[model samples]
Structures are given as structure tokens and as C-alpha cells.
Target: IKIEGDLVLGGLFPINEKGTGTEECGRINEDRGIQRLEAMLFAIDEINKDNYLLPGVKLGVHILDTCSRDTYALEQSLEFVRASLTKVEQENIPLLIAGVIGGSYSSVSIQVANLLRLFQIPQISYASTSAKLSDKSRYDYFARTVPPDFYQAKAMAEILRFFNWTYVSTVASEGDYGETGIEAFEQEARLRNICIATAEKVGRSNIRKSYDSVIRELLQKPNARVVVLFMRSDDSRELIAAANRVNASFTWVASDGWGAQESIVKGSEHVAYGAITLELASHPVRQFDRYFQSLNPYNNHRNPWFRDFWEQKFQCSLQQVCDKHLAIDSSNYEQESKIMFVVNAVYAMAHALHKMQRTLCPNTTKLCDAMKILDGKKLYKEYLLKINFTAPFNPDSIVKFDTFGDGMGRYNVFNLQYSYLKVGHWAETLSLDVDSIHWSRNSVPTSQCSDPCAPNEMKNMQPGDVCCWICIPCEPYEYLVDEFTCMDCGPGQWPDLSGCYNLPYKWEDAWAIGPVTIACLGFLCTCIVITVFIKGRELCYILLFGVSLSYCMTFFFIAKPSPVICALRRLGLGTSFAICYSALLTKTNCIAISPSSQVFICLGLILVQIVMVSVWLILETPGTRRYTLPEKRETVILKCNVKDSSMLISLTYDVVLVILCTVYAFKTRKCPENFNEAKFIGFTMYTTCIIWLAFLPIFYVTSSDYRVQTTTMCISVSLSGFVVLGCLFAPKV
Candidate 1:
């Protein structure tokens, strides 16, 4: 298609499918090719009619057929350069092209763009959506009306996030469109905490025959109910049919490749009933739709390809007589999605040309100095990149170019129910209305691999997928060791905000009363003994005073351990025993001694114990020690650090005194029947010896509980005092 004017723009469209082996072209593509071609013409006509836009300067077009092949598209794009190098003079006026427009696929655009760049001819695409084209350094003159698949990939992830679907499977056609989009989707999904259950690819060698493996993978993970497909419309059709045949219950999340092209799943629409798809933002160009429907084989003389589109649709040759002459109903026919984009691409060029015309040829109303010889470089930089104008089709929309020579990409999200429904939109931000969706399961389907754990439980991630996990709960008395571990607190310890800590253990008031009452009774008994024997021997007074000290020492054992109290414990323990035994020895030898002399002997014996205890204090030094038991690491027993060796050593002198007194009492036992005081002393020694013997074995055998050992020692001391009181003084009373 060609037109003569003051300045011309070149266009490339995939007018037909690639032919059979070795052939350059095949059948016509009415939706992708013919509609886009007419939309471009409509935009050009709209611009030409408005004299205020370019003011007496006419914009012309020279379009070529890419035939959906990159190599062929490359060959066709070179025609623009031929017009540039050769002189195409009409009535002595030179006609040179300004820029170029199409090549719908990324591969086709890339091939054509390589040729256009050398001549600095600006090329804008209507459908190519490769992220590679956004780089102005590589394809400097290249620009597009559509957004790259990168943005669409993010939008797909947004849809998954909207439904809270953390786990899903993915499949893409194995090429730039599929692989590039899938790669971008995988990255974006991870950022949103979504995980892919399985990622499969449609083989390039046989796209139609590659559904078995992809189906197998999808079926393998039944929990992944949502499947993402980044595939071309043709490739998607085969997969959709295969999914339906296998009867898989999958809610498909789709990219712009599947789009709102409902016909892809025509016969098997059930497979995509709950599918979500994204299409490049477009509006119904009511005028274009009416204009296209009004065209027939006889009336539309301007468009040369109109006859072929007409024959392809009605499936009859226009050259022969045919009855199919009626135009398609406007209400029933769905307008091609890219028509508005095609129109917008054309107007972008027209606005840039208008601005260029106003600057170069001030008030001329026609081509002047710099405008006559159009430089693509000057036009691209000064005009196209800076052009900002409202889109003619939609008054609310504005069109402009970015630094990358790309335009803002907006997508309309559609949910395929009985028909395609607009459920949401994505334009940098996502706006979804989930309540309006027609769900296949009667409610939203769960696409996650694992349910959330209970509040007190932790997650134990599964081996293969990050999203898959198991739940493990901790006991009430335990604390979390880490994210995946739990540990129980030891005895007398409990879990707090930090970890486990020791709790101070104290005996109950009832327990203390038992031991304290026994010592109190023993003290009362000793006082009675002192009262009855007060007028008797002066040595008895020394023994009474020592017995009182022994009862008081029991209170020290019951109280909480401290340095001063522990010191008194060591001193009182041995000294009390020393005085009692020493006095008893002096009395037993009454069969021999005097008041002041006996006092000196008893005082001197008690002094030896005080000195021994003093030496022990200086060496080991009395202090409260905390010992943790093996059974319960939490509780610690606080007691005096009294070495057993020092305690036994301190009592050794007292034990010798007890032995001598018992022997002397035995010897004096047979002294006299009437004066039988020796027999009473003998009884006191015999009973006290039995108590000491029992105390020793129990104290050494039972090791852990210091409370038990302390109580046992208190009982032995109290019993000995009672034994001494009854045997020596009770009979005399």
C-alpha cells in the first residue's frame, strides 16, 4: 500500500501467515492484520482532515506485508531505505520518507529495526511487547504503543497475591515471549512470598505436541490448583484443549499472550471458564468498528487488501458471483483489541509531525526550508520524544514518550466466565474487585501448599518447596529454642521472656514448725534439769549452760544460711558437745575431784573445741554455699560450707571425753546400791552413744537434701539433751 504526498511514513504489518515450506506468504490474518491496517489508515485520515494539525501539509503512508516472518519483514522494511537512496521525483518535487510504523512480533520488529536504524528512520510498533525493545541504545529508533511483557509478568503475580495464592505451577512457550515472561514472573512471585510448585516449558521443536509432560507435572502437585501460563495464543489453545481432555481442575493465571482472545479456547471454553487474563489497554473505537463494517468489495477502493480480507471472511472469491454480500452485525462482531493501539501509534507520529511543521515552517502553511528535506534524527529528538497530546479515541487518556522511547503500559484484567468479564486493571498499581468474580468452585479455591500453623506452634518447612511446611507445638512450661526447636525448663526453673531462670526455693511454714518445736521442748527439758540440780555440783551448771547452747544451735540450721549464722553454727556445734561431755567426765570421776578444779577442767576442755573451730573458720572460712542437685538443675540448696573432715575433727576431743566418762561410770556402777548416781550416768552414756551412732550413718548415707541432714542433726542434738536431763537430774527431782 502506497500514497503520494509532501512527506510519507512507512508501515509493516503481518498481513498473512508464513507459507508452506520455501514459500514467502500464506493465508490472510483478518483480526491481527487487516483490522490493524485499517486503524492506521483511519488515524492518518483523521490527521489529514484536521488542517490545524499540520496546516496544508499532507501526511502519506507506504506500508508493506511482513507475512509474519522476521526475514521477510526485514526484506520488506528495506524498501523504505531504497526510497531514501533513490530519487522519486513527481512534477520536479523530491519525495523522501519521514519514519516507519510496524512489525507486530518482537522477532519481526527486531529484524526490521536493524534495517531502519542505519537510515535513522524512527520505527514504532503496534503489538511487539519484548522488554528488549525498551533499551534505546540497541534499537534507538524503535518505540511501541504496547508495554513490554515485564510489566505484564508483574501483573500476573499481583493477581496471584490478590487471591492469597502462595503456591502454583507455571508453564511457558520456550522462546523470548514465553521464557522472558516466565523468568520475570518467577522473580516477582518470590518477592511477594509466593512459591512455584513446578515450572514446565512447551518445547519449541513441537509446541503442539508438548502437552503431556506439562500435564504430568501439573497433575503431580495436586495441591497447586492455580497454573500460570505465559504462552502465545496458538500454543495456549493446544494446552487448553489438552487440560480439558485430562479434566484437570486448574484455575489458570495468564499473561497478555493469552489475553482476552477468547477464540483461542473456542470449542473447549470450559477449560478457561475461571481463567484470568491481561490485555493491553484498549477502548472500542466505535467509528472504526462502523467504518470497517461499512466496507464491501465494491465501495472501499482506497485499501487494496480489503478484497482479500472480504474473501477470507466469507470464504468465497469476489471475482465470481456470490450471494454473501451482507456486512457483519456490529453488535455481534468483537472489535480487534489492538485497533485503538494502532490508531494511537499513528497519531503519535502525526502530532510530532504537526509540531515539527509549526517550528520549521513558521507561518508558511506548507513545506519550507528544513521541512522539505526531513531528517529522521531531528524529528525523533525534537518532536517524537517530546510530543504530548490527548488520545483522540479516548479524551481522558494522554499519550507521551518516555526516556526509553516507550509509552506507559496499562492492562485490563479479564476473568473468563460465560464471556470475558473485566474484573480488574493494572497500570503500575493493581485494582481488583474480587467480589465480582465467578468462581468455578462456588467459592475461592485455596492454592497454597500448607495451612497456617496454630498461634503457639512453629513452622517446620518441608524439603522440596519453601511454602510447604508442617506444624509443631511447644509445651506450656517450655520455651522456643529457635524457630524450629523447643526445650523444657528444669525443676525450680520456668520459661520467661528470655530463657529459663532459677526460682528461690523455701521450706513451708509447717515444715519449719516441726523441727523448731522439737528444739523448743528440748530447751524446756534442759531448763528443768538445771532447776532440779541447781544446788548440786557446780560442774552441773557448766553442763546446763552447754546443753542450752546446743538447743539454740538448732534454730540456726532452720534459718536461711548467711555468713554470720553459718559461723555460729560451726562454733556452737562442737563447743556445746565438748562442755556437756567434759562435765559428765568430771562427775563420773566424783569417785575422785573439787568445785574450782572441775570448773577449770571443763572450761579448758570446751576451750579446745573453740580453738579448733576458730582454726577451721580461718582456713576454710564460713560462708553460705549453693549446691545444685543432679535431679533438678533449677533448685539450689543454700547451706554452710562446713567440711565433714573439720566437723569430725572438732568433735574428736569431745568423743574421747564421752568414752572416758562411760568407762568411769561403768567402774563406779557397782560402787553402792543406795548411792547409785553412777548407774544413772551409765544409762545417759549408753543412750547418747546409740543416738550418735544412728546419726552418723544417716548423715553420711543421705546426700542430696541438706534440709534432711540438717533436721536429722538437730533431732540427734535435741535427743541427747533430753537423755542427759532425764538420766542425771530427773531421779533427783
Candidate 2:
């Protein structure tokens, strides 16, 4: 296995030798970040040893520390172009660089991508996931193993929705990922109508200043329990540091940059308690975990950056080293996480090379065994663009890109472990008391909340407290209301109708002295008319009959409801009026009837009314109808159910008869003053016309007392009838 020929692969990492800044960039992650690079080296070694991959070829790396800073990122990225141009074995053959992986910080990845797209070199990032990278034309040479912040932002919204944490505060690290990703999260959150109660912004570099800025915002809002953090794990740790010092507790929402340190991973850890964070969903790489047991600088000297790994992993200087014999861990952060993805990226490079070899040589092994030719354009245009693999490490997952070149993968959800004891109970446990600090990461997570409203009570939002609300008992007749609104019972009338001021139509129990006196006067006048009639004035007797009929019609004014009373309601008024006019007609010979026929004629008119009343009751029956008040419908009118009509259809005929009588008497005005005292009959008819005209106006007065209104009308009708006898017949008597 003469693996003399080598393919140049590049690795970008924030693997600093001397740590300075406490931010994610300069704060040295060689301990954790270099583990994946080590994993990539292991994969390369494995693929080289496998006879099927390159047969006799090996892939080598030219890795560099980006310091997690953009300036270093650009400076190191140009090194590839300079190496390709100045130091080449062959011209226009495979460029010296085969492919690139990493620049884990999204911002650094962005800076590197801006320069690399010029030569069309291929790059696959592990963590750079700003959606702007999805713009293929701009970041054409770039692809990532991690999903874009686009999906994670939506996930943040989903978590908010799942918990119904509708209103929250937002805090973000300053950079393209934080700025653009927060915009995306805001877009998603607003789509769900979630409110951002507070927004706190800080750049990751100024960890102490950022801590204060972020904590100031958190302190101001004791209301927002959830704060969506766009930060690196290191920056988040610092933000939590500020929270811990002040004893502030919150249900922190995490982006990808959380839960990757020693305290978080092992030994009843510290930092955030009861927080949710998203990580790459991956199964245990059992092979890598076994291989990880043998991580020794003595065995893998070909692997670069092992010295920095040695110093950090043991928490010592370069002179000191980890003992070769120790067994491991609460998920040895290296073997169980994105380190699998790092191995996948290397395997992807090796596989794609083999496929390109097969296509270019057509079943020959020269590219693997002899001299291999590599072309950046040919690789990009043909094989690398179609790099679809069945995931060498993760068997079920497909290591491929969607149209935008973002790696597709499911996210595993994790929360702070809830298994713990109080501070006094468990020693060396740094969890504070107020933040429910014992509460650390749990395997099967728990949900969070506040007191809910009871069935009979309504929730009222506590003043200035968005998370807390109070439940109040509803009033006796009030309805339980939803959030932000109330029930009417809205201007609706109550069932216990206690507010009507309108009076009744008739009262049966109360004695009426004035009504009796009026009735006595009318009967006495009837007697006077009868006395006048016995004096043998036939005109007097006919006039007396007319007067008596008019007096009998007084029942119209005071009539109340009963089935019989209501049936006769329309029937009685018309026949009584008809009888009075028919008597006058006989006396004056206006309509030509003798005294005997006058009575028959009047009966015939009354018979017509009987038919009208019978038809009305059958077709549109005089049922018991109520008059419900407009102010409140419950205060109802329990009165006569008169047949529904406009302006009394039966009364129209009575009115017509009155007009005829009045007109006829007017015609007889100068024609014989001896003829039944036509002047008196004329005067009496004119007065009757006046009374009926006045009744029409009084018909609509709902505000007036109904009993008084009816009593006045009936007494006035009695008085008008008495006038006929007193003026026309009584003078002759």
C-alpha cells in the first residue's frame, strides 16, 4: 500500500494556542473544537487504510486556526489560493486543494466564503448557518453540514407555540448569524402573533459588558420567562454568570451555541437550569466511541493540533499531558456529537473522489494507485456537486443537501437535567437556591407554568406582569370571559324584570266613584229621554233610541281582555254605532226606513258586523298578544289580544256611518226645525264627529296611564250621548 499520492484537504477551526478574549472567538475552544478535526483525521486514516477507497492514495490536511475571528479567517483562506497558484506540481490539473471543511463560526465562515467563491473551491461548514449563505449566487462555492438558522428560528417559534409562551424577551449576540437569525426568528414569532416584550443586544467580544447589558434587560423584565439567545456556548455561559450572581431565574431558549462545556456535560453541572437547546440529532457513533478510547498523541503523531488538544483536555500547560489510561464520560463531547458530522465530511470527500475517478477513468484504478489528476471546475461541475452519500457514520441519515445546499437533518431536543438536591444537602454542588438551581439537565424533560384560572373565575392579567395573572370571581349573573374581552350579558335585559314604569290597561279590584257617578247621570238622562218619548213625540222616541245606543257603546273605551270580551272587541263598537245612526236615519228619512224597519235595518247592519268579527277571529284570531317594552322586553303587556289590524278595519265602517249621519243632518239643517228638532240632532252629530276625531289622536300615547285614558274616553262618550236627549228631545218633554 504505497499511499505516496495525497489529496490536500483544509480545516478551519477556532483552535488558538494562546487564549485571550473571553468571547467565543479568542477564548480558545481547541479542547472541544479540535476534537472534530481529530475525528476528521481519524476518518482520513481509516479511509486510506481501506483498500476500496483510494487503493494506494491518501488524503492529507492543511488545517489552520481561524481564532474564530473574521480577519484571521480571510488571511488563512487566501493561503489556499496562494498555494494553488505558486506551489503546484502540474498546470491546470487538479488544483492543490481538493476540498475544504469548517470555519465553524458562521461569521468566520462567511468571511472565508466571500474570498473562496472567486476560484470556485467547494466548502462544507459544520456550524455556519446564516440563511444568507443559502443565496447560491453569492455563496456559490459554500455548503454546510448544519441546517440554516432559518429552520432553527422556526423551531424557536414552535417551542414558543408548544408552551404557549406568546410574549417573550429577545437577546442576541452581535454578528450576521445573530442579526439575520433574530430577524428570521422575529418573522416566525410574529407570524404566530407572539410579542417580543424586550430586546437586548450585545456583541460576543465584550463578555463582561455584554453580560451587564443582557442582564440589565433580563432584570427589567421579570415578566418574560423565555429569552431567545443567539449566542455561542461561551457567551451564553457568561450571560448566565450575570444571572447567577443576581439570583435571576428564567426558562432560557437556546440557539445552536449552548450546552458544550465540562460543567454542562458532567458532575451535576452549572450554568442554565431548565433551559431548552437544539443540537444536531445524531445516533451514537459506536465505532468512533470505541476508537475514541485510544486517543493518544503517541499513536497518532501524523494528526496535527494534538498538542493543543492535550493541554486543554487535561487542563494543563503543554509540558503536562493526560494519562493514557483514563476511561470516559457523560457523553465524551467528542464521540457523541457533531464530531460524527466531521467524520462524515471527510468520508464524503473521499467517496466523491472515488466516484470522480470512476467517471473520468471508466473503471480504472490509476487515480487511486498511480498519479491522480484533480480539477476544481471538473470536480465542482461533475462529481462533487452530486455528492450523495448514505452517511458512513449515521446509517439511517442521508448526507446530502437540498437545492439551497443546506444540510438536512432532524434536531434533538434537550433540557437542563432536573435530577438534583438542595445546596445544603449536596456539597460541591454549585447550583444556587433561587433559580431552583438544583434543577439541572434532565433526560426526560419537564414543562413550565403559572396558576391557571378556575372554571367560575375569569383571568385578569396582573399589572405589569405578563407571565402572572389573577383569577377573579364573576358577578352573580355575569358570564366567565375569555382573555382580553368580556360577556354582555351586553346591554341585555335581565330575566327578573324589575324596571318597567308603564301602567296597566284595566284594574278590576279598585273602586271607581267618578265612573259610577257618570253612569248614574247617563241612565237618568236615558229616563228623561224615555219620559219625552211617552209624551207621544215619535221623533222623541226615535231620538231616545239613538241616544241609548250611543250610551251602550261606552263599553268600547273600558273593555279588557277575555276570549268573549276580545271577540266582541271589534263586534260591539260597530253595531252600537250602527244602531244609533240607524235610529237617526229612520227619524230623518235619510236612507228611507220606517220605525219598525229602522230596527230591522239596524239589526241587519249589526249582522254584517257579526260576519266581519267571525271571519277576523277565524283567519287572524284574537289571541293573547303581549306588548313587551323597548327599554326591557321582560316587562310585558298582559292585555287584550285584539285581531291584528291597521287603524281598526271594523271602525272604518262606523266612522263612515257617523259621517253619513252628520252629512244627512247637515242636509236637514234648515229643513223643518219642528222635524225632531233637526237643529239639535245636527248639533249632536257634529259633537259625535268631534269625539271620534279626538279618539284617533289619543290612540298612540303609550306614556299615558292606560286606565285613566280609557276611563276619560268612556265618560266623554256617555256625556256626548246625553247631549242629544237634553237638546233635541228633552226640551219638547
Candidate 3:
């Protein structure tokens, strides 16, 4: 099988305005393309230098720029290939078409290649993974260096199942690429018994608005906690933005379509930090710092040039750029392994041609023979696995081919890190393994494993796992641990077996105990001084009222179980003392204001006191006062009317005295030497009236309709703290 002259290899890649943009060419693909181009050029030079293809036969490479974005139409891509072939024919060029790099371009290019099967031109796609292209019926002349999308989907399923996540919701763009990829994933999920909670579709054209409704509807189901995002980075951003706005907390599993870009995570930091996204295993791009420095030597590796490049090129900055670069360097890896596959496939084709005793040629018969020889297992065993290609191209070789031309390949899962992205001053610590999966700590303990030891034990990390060491619990009444360690209980406080007990209830309690007993003794000393100072007989009345009021207030401090009893006590003693003290003080002030009125006021006070006492006694004994008076031959009728009359008279006297005192004090221009007890009495009475008037009505309104008005009045009177304060302190002050 003698071949023609030098072989010409051509590739039809999309180069339309939509596809030519830097964003359409992801960082990894762009980097892969450049590297692959260099390797291909080197291989051509090597082939010519070594005369490996044929004696005096030089390889001619023809590259086509297919607009991958707008030129993604099947007809457009087919027309481009047709035109390129025509050009090759006219030029009399020995041509061999090598590739059409797989992208997020749906299956347009693949379908175009399938339609061109009659051409018999051997074509290999370095990146295309669409399952539709894997059918031999349509693409006998087509082959892919990389695994189909189904393989990646299967790998993802294995990982998800490994983590015991058997249920997931799929969120994908409404395009063929996204739909097909999700279908692949869904098939894998079904095989693994993973239930699909929901399948949501978003439009790539209007992703922002599309995702808004899609996410809202998807999240309506409670079981959908994990979202498998099958969209490009641009579409992913819109979905993520919507998810974040609604505070959607779900794990994100994305396909390779979403490039490992920082903006994907940065734009949705709130969602990203709380979420976990899966991507193909990506190693850090080592030499990034060096490369960065070299790119902008004037900026000392800290300039905005890289950022500017990223924003202009991809509309985003690097997030895990430094870390990703470091990982690549540390792990000795490349951006894309598919590039190595392309390089090896080219070499394989050349070697196959040599075995057939043919050089690179434009003759279709000779080229077809070369492709058939290259398809044998012998070639894969001898050169494919033996070369460095094995290490770089499908190092795992997990890719399995079926009779239907569909194949599966190994895919590494990687966590996106800041080092992998191009961004600000890179923090290396932010980088993490892309394959590493995060499990919720708050999740219920798995039935497959036993519980760990309690907090009293210390966990020791070991090679395989961690082991716990038991520790003793603190003794009762003693705190578990402080700045140092658990200490014994302090004096005057008993430590219970449970390690806790009653200590100081308040600051005052702490001060008045143990070695701090000085506070208690000081208080007692002050009480003695107060007693001696107010020893006068007349002051005894004030002292009695003050003591009773203090006792009533002290009831609040007692740990009483019955609120009703406490309230009753508070009201009874409080009201009685208040009225008695106020009347006495008012009488005293009346004497000061007018000496003649002093007699009348004192009489009024005495009369009110007598009436109150008599009414209380009658209410208790009913006819006791009458019975006692009749025995003495002087009948006394204790009338409730008399009590009311006395109250009115006392009130009149107090009000008149307060007004007179104010006038006299101002006219005399002399401040009273004694504390103006009249002003205090007047103020207390006025405030008490206002509080009673306002609160009494509210109490009645809140009380049940069935309750008596008298009961309401009583409740209000009992709760009046102002009345208590007035009764307790009026006479004393």
C-alpha cells in the first residue's frame, strides 16, 4: 500500500464570534490548545528530522478556526469542513483531518462529522465527549481521544453513591449539551438507585431570569438538598446568584462544562462557602508565581495585569489560581490530560502509516488503511500504553469502549480552591483537594458506624483513624474545669456529688458571707444608729408604719409558692400603713400652716382613724362594737357611712393645708427648717390618685366580665406600689 506525498492534517474548530472569545476558550482548554499545538509542531519537526513517516516526505498541518460559539450550528460547521476540504483538494495538499476539540458546543460539530462519513477522511476529536457522537452508524470515521460525557457522569455517580447521597435534584441549562449531560448523569443515578428529586431547566440565553424560576420551583421540594448543576460557568453564575438570594442551602455538583474558575465561587461566596461543588480533578498550576512574575516583571508578581487579563478575557479573576498552580507543580501535572491524548493519537497515526509501508498522503484509500491499522489493539499496546502518553493521556486508562463506540473514562473529582484561580494576592491556604468530599457534621450519625466517646475523653489522631482516651468527671459542687483545672468547692458552700451546688445568688449575697461578713455587721451597726436617732414617743408612730411597710416589701424577697397570698399581703399591709402615715403627716403640716386649723386637722385625722378601725372591727365581728358598747350602757353603731365621711373630711383638710402652706412659705420668704413633709404628702397623694385612676380602669378591662367591680378595685389597690411607698415613707420623711 504505497501512499502519496507528505500527509496534511487539518482540524475544523468553531471560530465564530460567539466561540472565538476568550471566555468560550476556557483557561484549561486554551492552555491545552497552546501546549498541544506546540507538541504537534514539535512532532512534525521530529518526524521530518527522523524520516519516520516516509523518505523525503514532510508533514503539512492545516488549522481551521471554527467559530465555536455562533458557528455551533451543525450546517455551519459542516459547510466549514466542506470548504476546507475543497481548499485542500484545490491546493493538491495531502490532507488528514485530526480534530474538532470538544466543547460546550452541544453536538453540532459531532453531527457535522457524522454527516461527512462518506468523505472517508479520518477525523479524531480530542475533547468531544457527547454520547451522540459515539455511534458507529453515524461516525465510523470519527473517534474521540477523551472519554464520552457518560463516563464522567458515571464517575460522578460513583462518588455520590460513595458518600451515601442517593437522592439528588438536577439543575441544568435548557440546551442540548446541558440536557444530554444531565441525561447521562440521570442514567447513572438510576443505575445506582439514586432518586432524582427534581429536574430543573434553565435557559443559557437568559440564564439569570431562567434560573430564578427554576431554582424557586426546584427548592420547593424538601428532599432536594443536592443540586447537580449541568451548565456553563455563565449559566452557573445566574443559578448560583438566584440560589443565594433565596438563601438556598444545597450541595452543588457541577459537570466539567463549568470551568474551574474563581468567579463561579466568588460570585456566589455566600452559597459557595456553604456549598460543595464537584469538578474534574484539577492540580495546582505550579510555576504560576514564576510565570506571573515573568508576565509582569515590573510589578513584582503583585500587579493587576493578570486580573485585568482575566476580567477582559474571561470576565472574572482567578480564585484558586495560585493553589491550583502549586498543586500542578507539586503533583507534576498538566492543565488538561486530553492534550496529551491528542499528541499521542497523532503519533499513533504516524506510526500506523509507517507499519503499512505508506507515508503521510492525501489519497483517501491510503489514509483509510492507516486509520484501520491504528485502530488495532496491537498499536494501543505497543505505542499507546508504552509511551509517556500512558502517564499523561488517561494515566488511569479506566476508559472502556463498547461495541456501540461509546466509552467510559476515569475522572478525578476536585474541590475548587483559590490557588486554581487567577485572582488577588493568592492565599495558598485556601486551596483544597478537588477530589476531597465534605460531609455534614450535623447530619445524623450513620447506622453503619458506632458513636464516638463523650467529651470527657481525648481523641488521638492516628494513621488509620482516631482513638479516644477516657478522663474522670469532676466531683459534685466543683466546676468541671476552669483556667487551670477542676477545683474544690469554696468554704461555707457544700459541694454535692454532682459537682454543682448553690453558691452566691447575687452580688449582695456574696458580699455578706464567709470572710466577707463585714457587710452584714456594718448594716446591723447602721440599724442601731437609726433606732437611737428616732427614739421619740411621737416618732414611734412613724417607726411603726415604716417597719410594717418594710415588712410588706420584704415579702417580695421571700420564696413563696403562692402568688395570691403574696399579693394579698402586699396590698393589705401596704394600704393600711400608707393611709395612716399620710393622715398623720397632713395633720402635722396643717399645724404648721395655721395653728387654729391644727386642732381641726388633728380632730379630722383622729376621726378618720377611729372610723377605719371601727369599720374593720365590725367587718370582722359584725356586731362586736355594738355588743361592747351596749354592755357599757353606751350603744355604738359602727357605720360604713362614717368611714366614708371621715375619708372625705381628711382629704379636704390635707388639700387646704397644702395650699395654705405653699402660700405662707412663699409670703414669708423663709424655707422651712424641717423636711417639707407636707409637700411629700401632697405629692404622694396626687401621684397615688393618678396611678389608681389610670390603672384601675385598665385592670377592670382586663378582668373577666363576670368579675365584680369591687373585686377589680381591690386588685388595683393591692398592686399600687405608689400607695405602698407613700404609706411607708410619708410619716418618717
Two-way lDDT contest, 1 vs 2, winner: 1
**Clash pairs for candidate 1:** none
RMSD of each: 5.0, 11.6, 24.1
Name the candidate, 2 or 3, with the larger lDDT value: 2
Would you give me the overall lDDT of model 3?
0.45
Instruction: Write the residue-wise lDDT of candidate 1 on 505-572 in tens digits.
Output: 35636556666787688678766666663363666677777777776776666766667776786677
Listed in order, each prediction's TM-score against the native is 0.83, 0.60, 0.43
Per residue, candidate 3 scores C-alpha lDDT tens digits across 551-570 of 34333323222333333333
Task: Give me candidate 1's TM-score against the actual structure.
Answer: 0.83
Q: Which digits, one per residue and each the tens of the lDDT, describe model 2 over residues 356-428? A: 7766766666554432435665665566557787877555377777777677746655555443222211111
Q: Give the candidate number with the greatest TM-score.
A: 1
- Which residue pairs come into collision in candidate 2? 94-374, 416-440, 416-441, 416-442, 417-440, 417-441, 417-442
